[PDB]
Amino acid sequence: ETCHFQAFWQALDENMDLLEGITGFEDSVRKFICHVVGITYQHIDRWLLAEMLGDLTDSQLKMWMSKYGWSADESGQIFICSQEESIKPKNIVEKIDFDSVSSIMAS
């Protein structure tokens, strides 16, 4: 909840039976981490993505990276979202007030 994924991976009881028996827990936790990355990073480092998702080797890292369609980028990053895409401010680009305001002010 406080987004300390690296601390979560380092503090998890590996041999607990109950953790194994939750069908699809492992993909679901990584999907949450990838969702936080996909909203909030335009580009991410390759080591940084592996660090966040719990020590994924570059074979496993593809099974996560290509699961969200994410591209390779130069020296030596991963492309997640464009800078133009992750802005789009709803505020200020407004003042359509006049047709509504003139109608209620008409008489």
């Binding site: 909840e1 406080t2 987004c3 300390h4 690296q6 936080v36 909203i39 909030t40 990073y41 335009q42 580009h43 991410i44 480092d45 940084l48 130069e74 020296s75 030596g76 990053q77 800078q83 992750s86 802005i87 401010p89 505020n91 200020i92 407004e94 007030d97 509504s100 305001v101 209620i104 002010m105």
Partner: protein
């Protein structure tokens, strides 16, 4: 003696009224159209349903504090009274909304929130102003419990401002009007602490000498306090659950205490986590774009000694507050800074000044109609 005994007298009346209500009101149009045609007053019916909910809630809290495990009140209220009144037809008028408003207010106090998707979808009747205010009061608390600060503040602002075009009159507010207004204010202040810098939209609902007082507290809380959080927590938890009434302090009972201890923990852990995020949200986005030295000055601001700065900076950024691009090659961190705007409220104010003059024109003309 006396106080508990009055609760039983009310329970005996409410159970008897429920037995009558469960019995008649699926056939009795003979009883009902005799009630529709004969009188020349109507407002009493709205008052009795609201008054019963307030008295029942006052009665339930006292029983629940004294008997803290395994006793009747929640099930007997839930299964028989609240579910039967929820599941039968609404009397034609806003009476079905009034029964739903108690059910929602009981559901809110038992913290069993989810069913608002069902409740809203069955509430397709016209929101005549009082039933708008009641609906907004519960919806603002539901958004607050959902942790939707942006949505909760708009709903709370409407009922705190109180310009909802209510016309009551006939004691319907009632007996807690001041307390209900402060209950909205208290949550609105908590929401303002989370959201500010961005509003710009507190001036409508909270008058300046309270914008001043919560502003001192908000700036101090995100710089050092402890005591503002302690003050904010102690006033707020008192108003968050809406328990209506306490009992009476003494050495001998535990009971109420077990009550209070459960309430304090549940609000504490969530508000503590949210308060830490509010402090992270404190530092201004002074420029969009940071090369390594500016990032290092942000790390120095963030934490020191030494070990582990950048690691916790990843977590602090990814709580919600920073959406950004990184270049490994150029060494530059690239972010946006969020923006907001003003001269919004005035467009609403021009409509309601027109209503305010018109309501006064109506009042003088209504008085004048008695001296014709």
């Amino acid at each position: 003696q006396w106080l508990w005994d009055i609760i039983d007298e009310f329970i005996y009346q409410f159970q008897s009224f429920s037995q009558y209500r469960c019995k008649t009101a699926k056939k009795s149009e003979e009883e009902i159209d005799f009630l529709r045609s004969n009188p020349k007053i109507w407002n009493v019916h709205s008052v009795l349903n609201v008054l019963h909910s307030l008295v029942d809630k006052s009665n339930i809290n006292r029983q629940l504090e004294v008997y803290t495990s395994g006793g009747d009140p929640e099930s007997v209220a839930g299964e028989y009274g609240r579910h039967s009144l929820y599941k039968m037809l609404g009397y034609f008028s806003l009476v079905g909304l009034l029964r739903l408003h108690s059910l929602l207010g009981d559901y809110y106090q038992a913290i069993k929130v989810l069913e608002n998707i069902e409740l809203n979808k069955k509430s397709m009747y016209s929101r005549v102003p009082e039933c708008q205010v009641t609906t907004y009061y519960y919806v603002g608390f539901a958004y607050l419990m959902m942790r939707r600060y942006q949505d909760a503040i708009r709903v709370f602002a409407n009922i705190l401002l109180y310009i909802q075009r209510t016309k009551s009159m006939f004691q319907r507010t009632t007996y807690k009007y001041e307390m209900i207004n402060k209950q909205n204010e208290q949550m609105h202040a908590l929401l303002a602490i989370a959201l500010t810098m961005y509003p710009m939209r507190i001036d409508e609902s909270i008058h300046l000498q309270l914008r001043e007082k919560y502003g001192d507290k908000m700036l101090r809380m995100q710089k050092g306090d402890p005591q503002v959080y302690e003050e904010l927590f102690s006033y707020s938890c008192p108003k968050f659950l809406s328990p209506v009434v306490p009992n009476y302090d003494s050495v001998h009972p535990n009971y109420h205490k077990e009550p209070f201890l459960q309430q304090l923990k549940v609000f504490s852990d969530e508000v503590q986590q949210q308060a830490q995020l509010s402090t992270i949200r404190s530092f201004l986005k002074l420029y969009t774009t940071m090369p390594v030295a500016k990032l290092a000055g942000f790390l120095d601001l963030t934490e020191q000694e030494f070990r582990i700065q950048l690691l916790v900076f990843k977590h602090k950024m990814k709580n919600l507050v920073w959406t950004s691009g990184i270049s490994a090659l150029d060494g530059e961190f690239q972010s946006a800074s969020e923006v907001d705007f003003y001269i919004d409220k005035d467009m609403i104010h021009i409509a309601d000044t027109k209503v305010a003059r018109r309501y006064g024109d109506f009042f003088i003309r209504q008085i004048h109609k008695f001296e014709e």
